[PDB]
Structure formats: C-alpha cells, structure tokens
Amino acid sequence: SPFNISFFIYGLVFLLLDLEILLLYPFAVSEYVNSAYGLAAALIFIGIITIGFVYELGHDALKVHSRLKSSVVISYLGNI
Amino acid sequence: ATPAGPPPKNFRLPPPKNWDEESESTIDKVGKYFLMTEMLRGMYVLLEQFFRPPYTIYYPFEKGPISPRFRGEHALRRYPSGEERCIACKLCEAVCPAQAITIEAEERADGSRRTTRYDIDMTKCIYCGFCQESCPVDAIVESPNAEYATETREELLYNKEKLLANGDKWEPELAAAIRADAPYR
Amino acid sequence: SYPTRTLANLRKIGLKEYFRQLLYIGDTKYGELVGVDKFGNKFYENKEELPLRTRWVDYAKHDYDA
Amino acid sequence: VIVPYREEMAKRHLKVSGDLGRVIFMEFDLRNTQSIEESVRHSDVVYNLIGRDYPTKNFSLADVHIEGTERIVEAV
Amino acid sequence: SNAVSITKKYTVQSTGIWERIRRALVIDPNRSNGVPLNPYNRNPSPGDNPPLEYTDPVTIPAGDIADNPYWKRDFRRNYPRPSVIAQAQQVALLSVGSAAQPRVELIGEEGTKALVAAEEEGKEKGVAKYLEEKGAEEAKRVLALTGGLPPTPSGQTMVTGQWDVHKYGLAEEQSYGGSYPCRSFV
Amino acid sequence: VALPKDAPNPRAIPREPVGEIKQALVNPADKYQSKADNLHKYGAWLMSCLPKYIQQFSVWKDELTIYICPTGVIPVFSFLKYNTNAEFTQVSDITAVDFPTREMRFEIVYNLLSVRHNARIRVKTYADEVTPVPSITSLYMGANWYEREVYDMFGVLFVGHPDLRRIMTDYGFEGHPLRKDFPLTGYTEIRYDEEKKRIVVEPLELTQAFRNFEGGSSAWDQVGPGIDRTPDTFKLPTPKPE
Amino acid sequence: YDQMPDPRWVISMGSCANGGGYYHYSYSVVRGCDRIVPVDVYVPGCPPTSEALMYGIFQLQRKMRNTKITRMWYRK
Amino acid sequence: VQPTKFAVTVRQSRNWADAKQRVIAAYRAWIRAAPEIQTMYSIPFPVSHIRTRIRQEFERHRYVNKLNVVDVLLQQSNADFQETMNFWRQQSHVMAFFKEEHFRGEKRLPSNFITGFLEGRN
Amino acid sequence: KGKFLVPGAPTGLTGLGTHPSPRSALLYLYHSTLEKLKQIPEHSVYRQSVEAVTRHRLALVESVVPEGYDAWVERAKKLLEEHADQFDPTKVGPEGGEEVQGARAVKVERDGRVFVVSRLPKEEDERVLEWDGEVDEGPELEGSRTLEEKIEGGLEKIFTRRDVKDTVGRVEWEPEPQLTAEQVAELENKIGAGLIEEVIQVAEGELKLVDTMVKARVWEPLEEQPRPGQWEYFERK
Amino acid sequence: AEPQDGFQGTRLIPTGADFQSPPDPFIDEGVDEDSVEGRKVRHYTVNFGPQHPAAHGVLRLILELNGEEIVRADPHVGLLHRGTEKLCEYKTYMQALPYFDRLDYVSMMTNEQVFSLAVEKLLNIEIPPRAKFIRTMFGEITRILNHLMSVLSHAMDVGALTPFLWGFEEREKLMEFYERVSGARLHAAYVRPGGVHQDIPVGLLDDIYQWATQFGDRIDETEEMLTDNRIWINRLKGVGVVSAADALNLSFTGVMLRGSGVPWDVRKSSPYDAYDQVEFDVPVGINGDCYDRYLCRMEEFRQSLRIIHQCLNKMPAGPVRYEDYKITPPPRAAMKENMEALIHHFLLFTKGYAVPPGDTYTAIEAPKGEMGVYVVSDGSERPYRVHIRAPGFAHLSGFDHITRGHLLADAVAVIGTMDLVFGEVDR
Ligand SMILES: *P(=O)(O)OCC(C)(C)[C@H](O)C(=O)NCCC(=O)NCCSC(=O)CCCCCCCCCCCCC
Ligand SMILES: CCCCCCCCCCCCO[C@@H]1O[C@H](CO)[C@@H](O[C@H]2O[C@H](CO)[C@@H](O)[C@H](O)[C@H]2O)[C@H](O)[C@H]1O
Ligand code: SF4
C-alpha cells in the first residue's frame, strides 16, 4: 500500500528546524559578549529561518489542514 | 420532512451571520482562545468532585440494596407442619420461558400427590420469576441469595434434594419477603 | 475516608482495633453492635454514614466470604 | 473417563472434550494407594500411560515404571 | 436563572464554616452533590412497609358483584375483522354505488338482477377494463368521490379530535437559545 | 446527616383517601371508525391508479394494506415514493412470513412511512422457493440490509440487489431458519476438538430434547368470529323492498 | 483464549455462557462456552448482579491462593 | 463488485444458453481458485482433491432442467465464492465441507443391510 | 437587508439549501410534468390525479408575480428574438456551451411555455482560482506526434472555443427578477407543503414518476390474478 | 404460472435497472496517457473491533482504506444473532415477552412496551390509566438510563472518561427503582400486555421525586465537561453528516433522523400510553452531524426528567393491570379463594391467552430510534410470526454511506453517535 507523504514531511521539518534551534543555543550562552552586534546577526538568522517556516505554513506541507448553491437558474418567459 | 399544511411559523432558519456581524468582542473572543477558559472551567468541576464524598461500597462487608421482590436462587418450601408445599401441578414447568424445569410425579406411599423428580437447570434459567408467580401454594420461590458461583456446572443442576435443602436454609428470609410482597401479588 | 471522621473513630475504637480493620475492611468505621450470626459474624449499624454504608459486618473467619 | 491428576492447572484442557458427568477428575499420587484404589473401582478398562524418561528427586525410573505399575495393577 | 435553591434538593448539605467555604469556592452554590439522605431515602425499606396498609383496587363497572354481565365488557371477542376489497368489489362500487350512496334507486325487483350486474361485471373485468370502456368521464368520477382531487392518507394523532398530522412548531422559549445549533420543538 | 431544612419528608405528608374508583368500559376499535372511510377511500384511489398490480386492499383499524403482484414491485413503490399524495419516503421494515399451505410459500411484507402526511402503509406481495422478487434498493437505500435478512432467513431471492449475501447466519450455514420446515435447534452443532486443534461441526444431539407444549392448546376456539366494521360507503347498496 | 499467556483462568458469567440459557434451543447458539474453552468459575444469573460477579472473582482469587506452584514441583 | 470485492448483482438467467454460460464460468472460477483456497485455509489435501471435490458439488446438480432452479443454485455458488475468497469463512467451515474430517469419517451411512443391522442403524 | 433569500443559505433541513430561482423552477417542473402526461391515456385515474393536483399547484404558483416581472419579460422576449442562435440547444447543446468559466444559457420549450436555463460560473475566491477557472485539459502534446494523436488531443477545439473575454457577437442574458422573502412565504402558505425548496424536491419527484408510470403501463388490466387461497390467513367463520 | 412458467425462463422479473430514466439534460447539476493521473492506487483493509465498551460488544467492521480515509465500510453482523424470532414461535405470548428485554439490553422496559402495545392492539383491549402512567414514567426512566449509557460510552470512546463514572452512579440509583417494582436490575419483565405485572411499592413515587430534585444538576455537570469543550467540539463537528433527504431514504429514525433538521417523534405523531397527557419538547438539530446529535440527546435528558415529574403528579388510582382474568393473571388471593380465578390462573400459565387473528405493525419512540414489531396472530395462544424492527439495524446499514471519506478516528465517533447495542441489531 502506498505510504502517506506526510510521514516524510514530519521528519524533514523537524530535521531542519531542530538543526536551526541548535544553532541558536550558542547565542543564549554568549549574549553578554555578543551584545547588539551579535543580536543583529542572530535576528537576521532567526528571520531567514522564519520565512522558510511561513512557506510550509502557507502550503500545508505538513498536510494537516484541509480536512451549496446551485448554478442551475431557471427563468420563466410565458406562452409562445 | 415537515408535516402537511402550512409550514411551521419561522421554521426556516435566519440567514447566516458574517464573521463581523457576530456579537462577541475581540477581547472576549481572543481571550477565550488563548487562556482556554472553557477547559479551565471543566478542570475546576473535577476539583469539586475531589472534595465530595465517594459513592463506593466496601463489599463483601457492606452490601447493596435489594428489594423484597429480588430474584435469586430457587428454593422449595414447606408448611409449618413440615410437609412439602409442592403437589406436582407442573404449572411452573409449563410456564418456564427456557424449559429449565423437569418434573416427574406419582402417588406417594400415603396416597398424596407429590414429586419424585424436581430438577432446575441453573444454566438454562433466566431468573424471570414466572415459576413463582404461577404457583398456587407458594412452593417455588427465588431467595435473595445471589452469591453461589460454583466451580463446575454440574453443581448448577439443582435436584429436588438441593432445592429443599435451600428452602430449609432460607425459610425465614423467604417467609419475610413473601410477607412484604403478598399484598401486591 | 477523611481526617475528621477517621480521627474521631480512633478516639473510639483504639489503635489495636484500628489495625484490625485496615487488614480486613480497609476503612476505619465505628458503630453499634446489632447482633451475632450463628457463624460468628458481627453486625454494626450507624445511621450517620454515607448511604448504603449504615450497616456492615465483621466476619468471624480470616478467609471470609459473603 | 476417570482422569487421575497430580497438578490442577495441567488437567484443565481435558474436560472440554466431554459432556457433563463424563470427565471425572481425581487427585492422585503414585505413592498413595487409596487414590489409585478408588480411581479404578468402577472402571471397565484401565489404562496406564504413566512414564518418565528421566530420574527425578522423587522417582527413579525404577520407582515410576515398577513401583507404580505394581501399585496400580494390584488395584486392577 | 434556571436553578432552584440547594435547600430544597434532598441531598446531604454542608454545614457551618464548611457551608460558607463551599458557597465561596464553587461554580454553582445551588448544585447538589448527589448524596441522598439517610432518614428520607428508601426509608423504611420495602420489607418494612406494612403489608396490611396496601389495598388492591377494583373499579366499579368491571369489578362489581351486581351490575356487570361479562359479555358487555368482552372486547376481545368483539374484535374488528379486516375489511377486504378486491378489484371486482370496486368495479361494483363504482357501477351501482354504495349503501351510503347509490347510483340507481334499486327498488324492489329488477334491481336485484341489477345488483348482480354490478357483481358480475366485477369478476369478468378489472377496474382497468371498466375505466377504459366507459371512458375518461368516469376517470373524473373516481376523483369526484373525494371532491375532484385524489385523497390524502389519514394521519395518526387525533390530539385535535380528528385524525391529522401533528403540527410541529417551535417552542416559545428555546433551551439553548440561539447559541447552539439545536432548536426545541413543541 | 445535614437535612436540606426546606425539603420535608415526602412520605410524611398524608394523602387524601381514594374511595370508589370508577372507569368506563371502552372498545378501542371504536376510536378508529372516524378514519375508516378515508383509509378505504385512499386504498380505492390507489387501486384505480394502478389497476395492473393492486389485486386487493384490506383495512383493519388504523392500518391500510395493499396487495400487489410481484412484478409490480418497482412501479407500485415508485408511485408510493414519488407521488405528491403518497409521499411515503421511508421503508420502515421489510420482512417475510411463511405459509407452507400456499403454492407461493412466502408473503413479503413492506411497511412504509410518510413523514409528510403522518401516515403508514403496508404493501404485501408473494414469493416462492424459486420465484424471485424485484429489489427496491433502486428506490430506498435503507432497504438493502432488510432484503439481505429476508434472503438469509427465508431463501427469497431479490433480482437486482447488489451483494445479496447472508447477514445473520454463520458462514457455511445451510438452511433458512425462519422457514417452518426448519427445526428450532437446527441440524448441526459445534465444539472444539482437542485432537484436531480446531472447532469442528457435528450432527446435533441434545442432552435434553426440547419439550414442545403445543398440544396443550384449547380444544375449544377462544376468540370467535369477530365483528364486521366496514364503512357503509364501501358496502353494496341493499335493494329496498317493493 | 489461545493467545492468553499462562497462567490462564476463565470465568463464565451468566446463563447464556454457562449453558446456553434462553437461547439454548437455537440453531445459532453454542450451549455453554465450555464446549469451546475450559472454565474455572461459573457465575449464575441472567444477569448476575455486580455483587455476584464480584463473588465469582473472589472464588477465583481463593482458587489461586490455594494454587501450589513450587510445592507441587517438590512432590514431583 | 461495487460494495465488496467479489459481489455480483443478482441476475436472472435469460435462457439456457445464458444459464449454461454462467455455470461454466462459475465452475472455472472455483477450480481456478483451488490453490488459493488450499493455502489460506491450510487444507491438508492435494489441490487435486479440492478440485475433484469442487467437481462433485456441481455434479450433484447436472440434471436440473428448470431455469428458475439454476439461478438460485448459481446465486448460492457466487455467495459461497465471495465468502471463501474474502477470508470470511473460518478454516473450520471450509474443511468441514470435506466430509471425511468427521471422527466417524466418510463412512457414516451403513454399507449394506447386515452391517447396519449389527451396529444398530450405523 | 432580508428582503430576499440568500441562495444556498441553509433552510433548517440539512443538505437542502435555498433555491436560486424557486418560482421558475417550480413552474418548469409542473409544465414539464403536464407534457409527459400526454403519453398516458385519458381514462387513467393516475393521469387525472396527477393532472388535477399539478394544475392546482400550477395555478397558485402563477398567482404570485415578482415585482418588475412584466418589464423584465418584455426585454427578455426581444433579447431572445434578436439573438436566438446564442441560446439554441441544437447549436450550443443542452448546457449552453463548454466554456464553464463563461455564462451559459439555453432556451427550452415545455408545454407551450418558454424557459431559459442559465448556468452560472461558480463564485470562487480569487486567491485560489487559477486562470479564472479555465478547465485544465492538460498540456498540449508537443514533439513529433501523429495526425491521429493530435485529434484525440483536441486540436480541432482551437477553431471552436472562444476567449471568455470575447463578447462582441454575443449579448448577456439578464436573469428574471425574484420573489421577495415575504412573497416566498406567501407561496408556501398557499401550496401547503412546507418550504419552497422542499416543494421543488417533491415536484421534481412527480416529474420522474411519469417516466416509470408510462413504461410500466399501470392503466393496463391486472397482470397476475391471485390464485385461489393466496391472500387467505386464519380468519374464523 | 409461477413456478411452472419459471421452469423454462419465459418471463424475466422487471428489475429497477430496467426502469432507470436518464436525468433531464437541461437542469442537470454536477484518458490513458503517460501521466501519473492514470495510475491506480492500492487500498488495504482493516479489521476494526471489538472495542472496550459494552454496547459495541460484537462489531467486526472491515474497512477499506486509501491511506487514512475510509473508502468503503463493510460491517459484518450476526455475532449475536441468537434466533429470537424463531424461538418466539414455540412460546406463548407471555413466555415470549422476556425475549424483548434482551433486544436493546440498555432500554429494557421500552422493548417490552412495544411488544405489549402490539399484543394489546390485537387483543382489542384498553389498559387502565394507572398502568398508562406507570408505563410512561418508566419509559422515561428507561430513556434516561439508555442515554446515560449512550452519551457517556460515546464520550468514553472519544476519550473523556470522567463523565462516564459520574452518570453511572445516576444509572446505579435509577436501577434501584427497577429492582423495587420487579426484582431485576436489568431484565424487569415488568411491562406486559394489559398493563404492568405488579403495582409499584408504596414509597417509590417519593423516592423518584427525591432523585428528581437533583438529577438536573447531574446533567449540568456532565454538560460542564463536554458541550463547550473545544476538543469535544472539534471531534464531533462535521462528523457523520447526513442530509435530511438521505436520512429518510436510509431508514433513519430518532436522533439520527432528528439531528438533520426533521421534526419527528413517534410520541408526538402517533401518541401511545400517557404521552398525549404530558407536555414535552422535541430537540431538532441543524447540521446533521455528531455535535447536533450530542446536543439533541442532552436536551432529551432534561425533557424526560420533565415528563417524570408530570407523571408523578397525575398518577391516578386503580388497577395497574387490565381488569379481566381471561387476559391478565388474577391476584394470588383470588386464585386461592375463588373457583373462576383459579381456572383463569391455571389456563393463563399453561395455555396462555388466545390473541384474535390478524397482523399489526406497532412502533414506539424507543431511545435508540423507532422500534417496531410485526406480529402475525393465528387466533391461537402462540404467535405465528414475530418480527422486530430495531432502530440500530437500519443505522448500521447506513454506516458506509455516512463514514465514506472520513478518518478511522472519525468513524469511532460515528459508531457512538448511532445508538448501537448489537443484541438489538441481531435478533
Ligand atoms: P456439460 O454440458 O455436460 O454440463 C454443463 C452443465 C452442468 C451446465 C449442464 O449442461 C446442465 O445444464 N446442468 C444443469 C445446470 C446446472 O448445473 N445447475 C447448477 C449450477 S450451479 C452449481 O452447481 C453450484 C455448485 C456448488 C458451487 C460451489 C462448489 C464449491 C464449494 C466448496 C469448495 C471447497 C470448500 C471451500
Ligand atoms: C514571527 C512569527 C511569525 C509566525 C508565522 C506568521 C504567519 C505566516 C504564516 C501564514 C501565512 C499565510 O499562509 C497561508 O496559510 C494557510 C494555512 O495553511 C493556507 O491555507 C489555505 O491553503 C491550505 C492548503 O491548500 C488549505 O489547507 C487551507 O484550508 C487554505 O485556507 C494559505 O494558502 C496560505 O496563504
Ligand atoms: S412448585 Fe408449585 S407450580 Fe411447580 S409443580 Fe410444585 S406446586 Fe406446581
């Protein structure tokens, strides 16, 4: 039987975001030295990986979402 | 789908309201979403139960309530004299919904009409009580005893020697339940 | 049970009887003796308990049975 | 069928094969003669299938195949 | 609101400081806890209800000793029979009418032989031959029995005194209000 | 125990004594005469509109029954489904009754409901061991499982049915239990065979044979003939004398 | 039942499982579940009261308290 | 086969040419399926014994000369085919069609007069 | 505000939504029903029953008239006359065309009466509609391809279809004026069969029955007599 | 000339596919290539059941799945078919009454009500006013009992486990009233042709009133947990949606019929017993989904309580049993004192009463939908044919049409919204 593609998407979106949050943990234990310049760079890095997150939100890649008037209109004209 | 004649007064629904026609403030609407207020109310109702008395009965030290009409295991009764009340009419055999009663009778040595066989298949019986409604002499009853699980189902083939032994055992309670319910019977 | 109830019944039945009940019934319970069965069982009543708990039995045998 | 048994749990699968009153179970020991005696007093045919392949702490191949056949056939 | 006071609810109550504590920390103070009352509920047991107090009644007509013959009140043996009408019967009913409404006077003789003329035509020809040959005029007559329209079937209520459909209407006050997708009907 | 304090003992209140109870005697059939004339009228209209299939109609109390030819099944139920005066859009039940004294053994009984007119109608046809009946699952989706039951329990066969398989009985079951020639306990019984390691199927033996107490039916008839209750609008006019 | 790891016990509850009950004389009913599996306790009633099924569990719990496991292996 | 895998809408044979065509197609499917029936139901018989026994069940009704009788005998076959090809019948129902897995076996009527007399009617 | 019923709004009955044009639908179904009744002989009570009831409902439906109806019908008469080929079932099929993203009408005649059946492109969100809703038959076959393959790929449809914006030789059919929501309620209080949309459901059922009532010839004599003792049960006497 | 004319096949039976008619072309509402569109997808089948709750004891429904969604649902029933309709032909009418307790085994006194009403109609008897009110009171106590099982087991399947335990104490209290009028917690056998078996005991109407004073608070707290809960709402909205036209065409009755916006209750449309004497409302839903059917069932809790209180205040005096010993058993005291009474006692318990010939289809508003029985009488003392119409049998038949395209976690919700006890479905 075919397997559903959403299983792949769960592992992939985790794998990338999990790598992304991992790259931010050094920032949280180096904040005082990083100061304003480090913050700006981390904000830029946070901003880029956020835009890729609104892409899967915008496309339902996780395939989590996505789960009547009649066109026929009659007119009466009368006798011939 | 509706009855004949004029349609019910305002049976048809109102037109649906758009999202911005709804009467619910954004503050109330957004707060109920993020604070999860209706789920908080239900969790609070479980705290209310926590501090209320429980319903539990400690069995077998405390028993649940049973009425005088309760339908438990069968018994064959006597008169104050000591004679068996049963005269082998076989009415309880005819009315049995599950054919659980087998009776063989004849003339006793003294000429009295009495049963020689009286078997009740406790694994055919449905505990309806019909056998005891049909008796003309109150001979067959159902005691309030519900505690008689056995090991083998051969133990559930009650013969006339066991059903009389049951009546001798349970007579005070049988006479008491009959005394309570007789006016209604 | 609850502390107010279980405390009061200790003040009545004593600590040797409190442990007897924990081993069998599993509750601390106090009531008046109503009578004894031929089998030796003892019966108690207390109108002040929860409904269906006003009458109980203390069995005579260790391997008790209904 | 009178089925003498040593262990209660083991014997249970044998009762399914018969109607009520047909498979009778008797608690027996190869060294208790009364249990053997009263197992065969009503029987028409007696079978003896008792046998180990090994000695135990309670039975030597001598005890099982001799002292049991003795004790049982003496009841027959 | 819809609640009635706890003091009328036949459940065990909290007392004193605990009542004040309960009426403070609780969603609805008028809610009971479901614990019944010992001096009131199933008290006495049915086993101590006095046997001699209860009375098994009789109603005067059917249970009397002196003015009821059984055969006036034997409605089981006055049961209705099923009334059957086949195609032969309806040919005759249209042909010569009905004991309620005749088509011809049928006076004395030469009307009895007209009464078999209804019965004879019924066996020989169905209602289909009968309607074909006497024309569409008496196809209009079959509807003329019920006023020129086909009859509608009988309803099964008689709460208005006549057999009819039940008039399902919205109840005056809705139980969910408009707040839930469920309307109450009377 | 803390009594409610404004909820008194409902048993302690004294009751006003009831003296002589009197109940009028009613004949429950009498309530149905007011609708007897239209139930006859509706059945008469029905069999004039479909003379090809409607052999007769009966009326008992509030029930009008229509008796139809087996080949008329599709037309008759279409008319009773899609007519504006016959808006009978539910099948409530389809079952069979067995009459082995008839050449056609099986009577097929359909019960239909009209929510529009608050009305019920019964349709009866007949079938045989080999004579099939049209299926009406083209008109009522709810009738599908009912016909499986009639087939499973009686052997009647429904032409046009998708997936007419057994619905109630076991998988290799042979026989039709609601037939009157079929015995109550059947012909076979099952058990577990230890030697074969499965459940096996055996010829039926009963430790106690079933005791059939039919012979104790009264030697005397106990209901009688009944009472005729036809409207005068559906009786033949009587010839007046002279 | 064949999938129950040992040790195994079966309780037959009610007249229908015990011996067929109201449907004993039918073509579709097994007259007792012990034509299929072994049973250790039979609880009577249609239906037994909840106390009655509790009583049956206590009978079974007592049967287990009387089960000799390592004391049977010792006699043989 | 709209509702179920092997469903066939109930059809009434139009004539004997049609009725014989259906019988042969029924027999063909059954004897085709015999290897598939012998693995699923673990029948301890050769596929040949299964096929020769399938033949007997058609050989019983070879002399039916009524067209209304053939259709009920065909519907019974189609329904039996559907419940066997879907694993709906238990091994117990299937290998109970073979009338030698009785502990009395195939020999269940008495052979002649005398052997049934000495055994009390078998 | 509530002067007119929203089409497709829920009625209270699940699955039944408010009819876009209830009055003309009911008129179309009644007249169509009256036309198929001429396949049935005059002496059948079925036809008389259906005729009388249908004419009775047809009279009450025609008793109510939408406002501006006389004005609208005069324009619609001319609009049909001067552009008849636009609305011809023999020219543009039973459907009014194949460009489902464009308006489609067709003139249909029943029982001496004229109707236009206009099918309107579905209103969808612009954020989800690709190519204004033009149906995607797939990509064109490209590469080395045969004559036969190009035909079955639809090539001859180039010389038949039209750009949806191409509206020069065509004229826009204007819809009929509707009843008011109060007028619809008054229609309901006359006919006496519930909601208007539920009456159309019954009315289009009477239309389908005529086809079965003619094929089976229900007015013909009884097919199979009851053989003796067929409807006999257990009656005494 | 069937079956003779059918020997040679000279006639063919006109199937519904013969009378198919093409849709009207004008007002009619709505290939192989190298692409993957032409490719087919395999499906796999799944064996669902038995679930832990008692009501769905014998369900073996085989689903075909395309990924997650259900393609076709095939319930296999019969696992509790015990031959009731055949065994009823070998019993007298009084003997066959206990068979009705065991059809829908959570709604006992309303099963035996429809059998009594059917037999009473052929008997042509009118049952006394007191038994009419006793039956309508215990028919609503029964309706509350069934809904406590149905609603709380439904939410136990959906995963809410606490309302189940709270309302089974309410169930535990309401079975004390069964065991006081009869001696059974489950199978009373209390409702019988001609009224009820025995008069209610002398303190019961006070004890039901004491229960009544607090039962609404139990509904309100059960309603505290489910009605506004978003998890509950998001598991029942849009699930198992049936249109009003299809519910009728599918033989749906009860809340399955009523939840799609059809106002229809047998109690209001064909009144029986003391229902025409009581004021109550009928909850009718909008969207035809499981959330509507949950909200309609909770409203019936409050409506059944409102009937029980009215029955307590109109309880008339008099016989609770039809006053005729050729039909109902005489009192024990009469049988032991009067000649005619012992004769009528003896013949009723051996032969039974004769029912006049005829057939009747009788329906009541059972808690799970419409429950009806077709009884053929032969004028004798045993029924010639008893047929039970079970509301759940028709509901499970429409499970494929309703669960199509849904998820399996959606289908478990559809099983509970259809009030399904399989002893009802298989008779
Ligand atoms: P040739 O022309 O000689 O014969 C062809 C036939 C047989 C058609 C004759 O010409 C003929 O006309 N005979 C009468 C028609 C006929 O055969 N009727 C019955 C047909 S259906 C039938 O026979 C069904 C038999 C049973 C089907 C199932 C068989 C397998 C079940 C068990 C399998 C093993 C366990 C799973
Ligand atoms: C600083 C933190 C920022 C957090 C993220 C901020 C918001 C950005 C994410 C949402 C942006 C809009 O993206 C929007 O997502 C929704 C929900 O899947 C999509 O939703 C739409 O398509 C999907 C896929 O067919 C359907 O399942 C859905 O029913 C439909 O409404 C829209 O196609 C997309 O336009
Ligand atoms: S117990 Fe009663 S009914 Fe039964 S045989 Fe004896 S006397 Fe008759």
Ligand code: SF4
């Ligand atoms: S209670 Fe048991 S023994 Fe008595 S009549 Fe009923 S089924 Fe027979």
Ligand code: SF4
């Ligand atoms: S309650 Fe009675 S009828 Fe029901 S399953 Fe149990 S034993 Fe059988």
